[PDB]
Design a protein around this nucleic acid. Structure first.
Length: 49
DNA sequence: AGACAAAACGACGCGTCGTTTTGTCTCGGCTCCCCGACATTCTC
């Protein structure tokens, strides 16, 4: 009935993390946490790999 | 090729050593104490 959901988006050097507490059946719910973790490296590596 | 490290450019721009030159409160009235020197007399 109430569900904790963790959405993860994975990039070349980025992790997008979001955590929500959804109750879809009643059109309710709210977000709990959001963030993006970045691993720095030059775009030379991005164009090279 | 990328993106960081720093040299280069700018007119601009202000600091900096070594010396020279400049600027720096003013006058009025009195009173009463002390001392110094130089003349005379007098004592020793």
């Amino acid at each position: 009935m109430i569900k904790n959901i963790l959405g993860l988006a994975l990039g070349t050097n980025s992790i997008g993390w979001a955590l929500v507490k959804q109750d879809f059946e009643n059109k309710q719910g709210e977000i709990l946490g959001m963030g993006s973790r970045i691993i720095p490296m030059s775009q030379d590596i991005l164009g090279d790999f």
